Amino acid sequence: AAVDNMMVRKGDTAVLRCYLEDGASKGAWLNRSSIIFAGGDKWSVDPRVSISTLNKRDYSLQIQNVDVTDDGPYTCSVQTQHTPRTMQVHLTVQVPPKIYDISNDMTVNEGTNVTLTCLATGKPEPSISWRHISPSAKPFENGQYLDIYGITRDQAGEYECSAENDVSFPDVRKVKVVVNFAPTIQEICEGAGVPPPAFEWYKGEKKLFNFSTRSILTVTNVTQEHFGNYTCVAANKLGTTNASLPL
Amino acid sequence: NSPADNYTVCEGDNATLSCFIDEHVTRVAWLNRSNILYAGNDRWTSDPRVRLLINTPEEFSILITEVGLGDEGLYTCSFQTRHQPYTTQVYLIVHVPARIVNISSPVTVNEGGNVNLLCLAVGRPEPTVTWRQLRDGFTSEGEILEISDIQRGQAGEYECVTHNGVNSAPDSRRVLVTVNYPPTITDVTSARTALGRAALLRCEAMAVPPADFQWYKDDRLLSSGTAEGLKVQTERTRSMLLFANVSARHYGNYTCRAANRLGASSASMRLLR
Numbered sequence: 456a457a458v459d460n461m462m463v464r465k466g467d468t469a470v471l472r473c474y475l476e477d478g479a480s481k482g483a484w485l486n487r488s489s490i491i492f493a494g495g496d497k498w499s500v501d502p503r504v505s506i507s508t509l510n511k512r513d514y515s516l517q518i519q520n521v522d523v524t525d526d527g528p529y530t531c532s533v534q535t536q537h538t539p540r541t542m543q544v545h546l547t548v549q550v551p552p553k554i555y556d557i558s559n560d561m562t563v564n565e566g567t568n569v570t571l572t573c574l575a576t577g578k579p580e581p582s583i584s585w586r587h588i589s590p591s592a593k594p595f596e597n598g599q600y601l602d603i604y605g606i607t608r609d610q611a612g613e614y615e616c617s618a619e620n621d622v623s624f625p626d627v628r629k630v631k632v633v634v635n636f637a638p639t640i641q642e643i644c645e646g647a648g649v650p651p652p653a654f655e656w657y658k659g660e661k662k663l664f665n666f667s668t669r670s671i672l673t674v675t676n677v678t679q680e681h682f683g684n685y686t687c688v689a690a691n692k693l694g695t696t697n698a699s700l701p702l
Numbered sequence: 703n704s705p706a707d708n709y710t711v712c713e714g715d716n717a718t719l720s721c722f723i724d725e726h727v728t729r730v731a732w733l734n735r736s737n738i739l740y741a742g743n744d745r746w747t748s749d750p751r752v753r754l755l756i757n758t759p760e761e762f763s764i765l766i767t768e769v770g771l772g773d774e775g776l777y778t779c780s781f782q783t784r785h786q787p788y789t790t791q792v793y794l795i796v797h798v799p800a801r802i803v804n805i806s807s808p809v810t811v812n813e814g815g816n817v818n819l820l821c822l823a824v825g826r827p828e829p830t831v832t833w834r835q836l837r838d839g840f841t842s843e844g845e846i847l848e849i850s851d852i853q854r855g856q857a858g859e860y861e862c863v864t865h866n867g868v869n870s871a872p873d874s875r876r877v878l879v880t881v882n883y884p885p886t887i888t889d890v891t892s893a894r895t896a897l898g899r900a901a902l903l904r905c906e907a908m909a910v911p912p913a914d915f916q917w918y919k920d921d922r923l924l925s926s927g928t929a930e931g932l933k934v935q936t937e938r939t940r941s942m943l944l945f946a947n948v949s950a951r952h953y954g955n956y957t958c959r960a961a962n963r964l965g966a967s968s969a970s971m972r973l974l975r
């Protein structure tokens with residue numbers, strides 16, 4: 456019975472069962488064409504290879520810390536006086552994916568085109584796919600390189616690279632991007648710009664003495680001298696804009 | 703290039719497998735496919751035909767007595783040093799001399815027909831079958847030989863020969879092909895002889911099987927009897943109508959007829975004065 460093809464993970468311990476027949480039967484384990492065990496003798500010099508004998512009829516090959524070098528065909532030749540028995544087993548060792556490179560957390564200004572890279576390795580070859588943290592988005596196409604042309608304000612956030620395999624796939628690392636945009640006043644003041652701007656309240660000729668995204672002026676005990684048309688100046692390192700309002 | 707050497711032995715011979723090693727070899731063994739034959743001095747195989755010859759720390763050699771076709775396979779010598787394992791592999795190839803096992807029976811066909819001749823031989827390695835024409839030099843490298851619109855000159859013995867390149871002889875065999883054709887009258891002679899002198903009529907029609915020639919004097923046919931003083935001599939390709947001395951009744955028209963299983967023919971000749 457047992458198995459013809461056995462799949463295990465890298466670093467795990469694999470157990471290749473080979474129950475033999477009753478009598479004075481002698482068993483031998485073979486890596487490819489070479490002898491690993493011949494009855495009680497251990498021909499192999501590897502410390503990871505051993506025999507697990509559950510009972511007198513049992514004869515198994517146990518490889519601890521199995522590696523990619525260990526994958527291949529293993530043959531257990533049970534020797535019966537009548538006819539010899541053979542139970543070959545193909546061992547396949549899997550390497551879980553490992554994202555070994557990803558773009559650093561960058562902050563690039565708006566309007567430019569940027570390319571994000573995510574490289575991974577494993578056995579078998581992993582497939583790299585992208586996604587956006589923001590809920591209003593569509594999963595990008597499976598590609599190690601993700602290129603966005605003319606990035607907008609809403610496209611910033613974390614981009615979650617996922618390198619997947621058919622088995623033991625989880626390999627997720629994120630990179631946050633911040634797009635810088637020249638601030639624009641939407642209502643008067645009230646605006647939105649990144650990096651956060653220092654709103655300047657300029658009434659007429661000069662400004663005289665504040666939420667991060669809004670600026671609130673104070674108007675109590677109004678005087679006739681105070682009346683006039685004032686302007687809201689919001690300036691940042693990227694841009695500056697002004698908007699007037701009468702009072 | 704690949705560590706799979708070919709070691710061919712004749713069937714029934716003894717095959718010795720020598721594995722040469724250095725001094726620092728811990729273990730060593732000879733293996734039939736993936737089954738151990740001898741592990742050092744320990745015999746693993748139950749086959750008495752496998753014997754141990756040399757176990758010197760410099761070479762490990764075994765013997766196989768009465769090598770058979772089943773013994774063909776990849777034989778490996780796996781041995782171990784203190785640091786790394788080793789394998790030297792050998793592929794046992796059994797040779798069987800070539801011999802024809804089936805060949806066509808002597809075939810007969812009518813002229814213009816189609817003939818196929820087969821020559822089946824067994825042997826390892828795969829034997830090369832060759833057809834040959836004994837009368838006219840012709841060779842065809844093929845197990846079967848097909849002759850289209852076979853003619854009179856193509857009939858004869860067709861020899862088949864097969865060899866596997868071994869020292870042993872090719873064991874060739876021959877088959878006879880005989881084509882059949884109806885008679886066609888080729889030559890006809892008439893005699894205008896005077897009274898008192900001998901004369902003869904003849905016809906020439908070749909056929910296979912040989913055509914039965916018939917002679918006709920006017921309406922009647924001749925029976926080769928001493929009555930009327932006539933005698934006909936029939937041959938494989940001819941039939942002479944012989945007239946010794948003369949007779950008044952002998953003068954007149956004559957017709958000969960040559961017929962076999964495939965057709966008939968007739969020609970008219972006269973006897974004049």
Ligand SMILES: *[C@@H]1O[C@H](CO)[C@@H](O[C@@H]2O[C@H](CO)[C@@H](O[C@@H]3O[C@H](CO)[C@@H](O)[C@H](O[C@H]4O[C@H](CO)[C@@H](O)[C@H](O)[C@@H]4O)[C@@H]3O)[C@H](O)[C@H]2NC(C)=O)[C@H](O)[C@H]1NC(C)=O
Nearest residue numbers: 539734735736737739747749751752766770772773774775
């Ligand atoms: C190397 O290993 C292979 C298999 O791993 C092994 O092949 C085996 O060979 C033996 C003979 O050498 C085969 O047994 C024969 O089977 C045929 C049917 O095909 C029988 O006709 C045979 O009967 C004869 O021999 C009997 C026992 O000697 C007699 O009792 C009998 O009257 C006949 O004389 C014979 O049983 C066997 O089938 C194969 N097995 C396989 C899987 O191919 C090969 O022999 C090994 N080589 C060496 C050198 O050990």
Ligand SMILES: *[C@@H]1O[C@H](CO)[C@@H](O)[C@H](O)[C@H]1NC(C)=O
Nearest residue numbers: 486487501524525526527528
């Ligand atoms: C086991 O077999 C493989 C071939 O599949 C080979 O690469 C390896 O070296 C062998 N031995 C060990 C100890 O890994």
Ligand SMILES: *[C@@H]1O[C@H](CO)[C@@H](O)[C@H](O)[C@H]1NC(C)=O
Nearest residue numbers: 566567568569602603604605
């Ligand atoms: C990427 O940006 C550069 C710089 O402005 C521009 O020249 C190029 O055309 C852009 N590529 C695409 C595909 O828009």
Ligand SMILES: *[C@@H]1O[C@H](CO)[C@@H](O)[C@H](O)[C@H]1NC(C)=O
Nearest residue numbers: 657686688695696697698699
């Ligand atoms: C607004 O900014 C523009 C551009 O610098 C400038 O020309 C204009 O005078 C400004 N107006 C006010 C009211 O600040």
Ligand SMILES: *[C@@H]1O[C@H](CO)[C@@H](O)[C@H](O)[C@H]1NC(C)=O
Nearest residue numbers: 704705706707708776792793
């Ligand atoms: C036998 O000879 C052939 C020649 O083509 C070679 O390719 C092969 O490796 C040799 N050994 C075998 C078949 O074991």
Ligand SMILES: *[C@@H]1O[C@H](CO)[C@@H](O)[C@H](O)[C@H]1NC(C)=O
Nearest residue numbers: 714715716753765766767768
């Ligand atoms: C093979 O060896 C056996 C015993 O060693 C011997 O009897 C036999 O004659 C040998 N074969 C041939 C063909 O000589």
Ligand SMILES: *[C@@H]1O[C@H](CO)[C@@H](O)[C@H](O)[C@H]1NC(C)=O
Nearest residue numbers: 803804805806807820821822
């Ligand atoms: C050989 O094969 C032919 C093919 O049909 C068959 O008729 C014949 O009986 C076989 N044996 C001989 C001896 O021709």
Ligand SMILES: *[C@@H]1O[C@H](CO)[C@@H](O)[C@H](O)[C@H]1NC(C)=O
Nearest residue numbers: 920921953954955956970972
């Ligand atoms: C001989 O042949 C001629 C021409 O065919 C024919 O006219 C004649 O009758 C024949 N002779 C006899 C006796 O019939």
